[PDB]
Design a protein around this nucleic acid. Structure first.
Ligand SMILES: CC(C)c1c(O)cc(/C=C/c2ccccc2)cc1O
Lengths: 329, 289
DNA sequence: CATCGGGCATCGCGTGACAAG
DNA sequence: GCTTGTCACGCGATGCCCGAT
């Protein structure tokens, strides 16, 4: 018995009824605090109010029941195909919505991000750029957001648009809708292969460096099988353009002495990626005359490949060229 | 100042602004439900409205709505076993100007450019996938499409597969579930076969011709050259082979990605295999004028 | 038609218990 | 063994309601 105690008991029982109705699993609801309960219910109301204005499957001439089952999860399928997460943010930099997959990419559970300031997730060095993006209306940019999986940040491509967020019922002593960013955030993409595993691999070549054999680890690293490896030309068809002259010099060194010497260069994999290698080419002889080459390579990382490149002995044209390549039969 | 009091006053402010956030949220709920009342009235009206509105935060179609509003695209679920179109969303009509009639009963290979039909194969053999191709649409019209997606075990959990369904006898083991969406005076080096096909493209090409390296590789250089400059550029490419190791310079205009003509000076020379002295490729240094 | 004191309900404030990290 | 934060609670200052003026 106590007046204000019973008043706050009424407040708490209404807060309990509000928490019981949130569209989250009960294991997520039970670990919620009252402030987050109110915040999440506000978020749910604002979302449903916007969808009441903006929204509303298989055309009924292709209709099968398996197709209808798939259509009823079309949304989740699109979400899984994003390789990222959806982000809807308001002019006040409030996370109007974030998809659950944010937990898969940044570690932040969706329950804790909605109706919170998006800058809490964004690098201080990038909040200015993000706010510049928040204010002719399609958007394509990059930003580094907090990464709890690293525990640590992650650079993400944002692709989206600015559309009027209806049904927000903003006021002043009634307001029009303002532009909210509807965007998809995806990770960044690299272009070179680095082996995680020492993965020494040997391959045999003709005297013009045309490949004829390759061991297991070579297949594991370069992506080709034996046949496709040999039917693509000589070895120079796989070498990065910024390296072809160095390998040619070391090939003439091997021709004249039998040994290449430790050389470092890049090779084109089956998926058209560049992998660093430190290699050595030795000549086997038959009846005292050259027969074939046995080139053994160690997979290198880009951090040490670039280090070998900057401490380059000889210098030749195209030394610092960067580019992509292809390879046919 | 004093330890305990600094902590105490900051706790004071923390609780004060906790109450502030609480009240602010309750007035947001007041703005957000049908129908000045006190906070308990607001909470009761809010719980009644939320019960009228009612597990995921959004329904499936709200999630799809957000995705497609953000970055367009259309969902297609094909099989890796044959590329058979198991599913395609309705959003394929605003993306490719094609009905769902055209993709169902087909395979992904029938819907893309023929020259891409093999690249497609490399993306379906045996988690994530990210490629680009050319999809169909009074003669044939192809459009560049960036697809991204993943490989999923078929059939999906929770989707019933009835006995009389056409999928019953399919029995695919894996599927590509993907979304497909539409869409400076320097010099860059390049390598070509003796026919003139880009096989290595310097990244500086975007600064000189505006194309991405992928937009150039695989195509012949003459394809980007003015119809008049073509026989001259071809003669240059053929005479660079006869004069191996010698430099051949030739000026011609190159259609930029903005479809402008840019005058360029290309200097070409062969690459000699140090053993056989045979031509490996042609090195060009394409420079803007 | 107000105005006025009862008693309970709202409401904001500061502090202590307690616990997750 | 300290930090940050949640929750309850004691406590008055007004608030609402309403017979009684
Ligand atoms: C088969 C292919 C991927 C390949 C290889 O397996 C080794 C080499 C190495 C060549 C070389 C050249 C000079 C000196 C030492 C090695 C080049 C290739 O294209």
């Amino acid at each position: 018995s106590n007046p204000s105690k019973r008043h706050r008991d009424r407040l708490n029982t209404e807060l309990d009824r509000l928490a019981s109705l949130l569209p989250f699993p009960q294991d997520v609801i039970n670990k919620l605090d009252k402030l987050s309960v109110l915040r999440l219910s506000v978020s749910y109301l604002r979302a449903k109010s916007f969808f009441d204005v903006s929204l509303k499957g298989v055309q009924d001439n292709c209709r099968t029941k398996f197709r209808e089952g798939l259509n009823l999860q079309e949304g989740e399928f699109l979400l899984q195909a994003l390789n990222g997460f959806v982000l809807v943010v308001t002019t006040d930099a409030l996370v109007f919505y974030a998809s659950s997959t944010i937990q898969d990419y940044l570690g932040f559970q969706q329950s804790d991000v909605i109706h919170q300031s998006v800058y809490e997730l964004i690098h201080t060095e990038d909040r200015a750029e993000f706010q510049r993006q928040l204010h002719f209306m399609e958007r394509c940019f990059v930003c580094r957001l907090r990464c709890l999986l690293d525990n640590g940040f992650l650079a993400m491509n944002f692709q989206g648009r600015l559309k009027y967020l209806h049904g927000q019922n903003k006021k002043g002593k009634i307001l029009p809708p303002q532009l909210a960013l509807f965007a998809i955030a995806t990770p960044l993409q690299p272009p070179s292969i680095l082996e995680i595993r020492n993965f020494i691999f040997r391959t045999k070549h003709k005297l013009d460096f045309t490949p004829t054999g390759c061991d297991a680890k070579g297949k594991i690293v370069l992506g080709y099988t034996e046949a496709e490896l040999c039917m693509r030309g000589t070895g120079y068809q796989f070498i990065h353009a910024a390296d072809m002259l160095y390998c040619a010099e070391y090939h003439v060194r091997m021709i004249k002495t039998g040994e290449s010497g430790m050389i470092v260069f890049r090779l084109l994999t089956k998926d058209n990626r560049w992998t660093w290698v430190q290699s050595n080419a030795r000549l086997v002889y038959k009846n005292g005359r050259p027969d074939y080459i046995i080139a053994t390579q160690r997979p290198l990382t880009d951090e040490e490949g670039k280090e070998h490149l900057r401490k380059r002995t000889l210098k030749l044209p195209f030394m610092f060229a960067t580019g992509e390549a292809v390879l046919y039969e | 100042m004093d330890k305990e009091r600094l902590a105490r006053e900051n706790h004071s402010e923390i609780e004060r602004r906790r109450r502030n956030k609480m009240t602010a949220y309750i007035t947001e709920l007041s703005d957000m439900v049908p129908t000045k009342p006190d906070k308990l009235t607001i909470l009761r009206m809010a719980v009644s409205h939320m019960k009228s509105l009612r597990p995921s935060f959004l329904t499936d179609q709200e999630l799809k709505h957000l995705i497609l509003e953000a970055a367009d695209g259309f969902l297609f679920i094909v099989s890796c076993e044959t590329g058979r179109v198991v599913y395609v969303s309705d959003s394929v009509t605003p993306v490719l100007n094609q009905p769902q009639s055209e993709w169902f009963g087909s395979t992904l290979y029938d819907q893309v450019h023929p020259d891409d039909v093999d690249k497609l194969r490399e993306q379906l053999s045996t988690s994530r996938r990210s490629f680009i191709c050319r999809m169909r649409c009074g003669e044939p019209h192809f459009v560049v499409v960036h697809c991204t997606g993943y490989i999923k075990a078929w059939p999906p959990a929770g989707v019933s597969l009835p006995d009389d369904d056409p999928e019953a006898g399919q029995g695919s083991k894996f599927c590509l579930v993907a979304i497909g969406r539409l869409q400076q005076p320097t010099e860059f080096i390049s390598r070509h076969n003796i026919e003139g096909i880009f096989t290595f493209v310097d990244h500086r090409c975007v600064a000189t011709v505006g194309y991405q390296p992928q937009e150039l590789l695989g195509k012949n250089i003459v394809e980007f050259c003015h119809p008049e400059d073509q026989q001259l550029l071809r003669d240059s490419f053929q005479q660079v082979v006869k004069l191996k190791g010698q430099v051949l310079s030739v000026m011609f205009r190159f259609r930029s990605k903005n479809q402008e003509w840019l005058w360029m000076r290309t200097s070409s020379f062969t690459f000699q295999n140090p053993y056989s002295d045979e031509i490996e490729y042609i090195i060009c240094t394409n420079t803007n004028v």
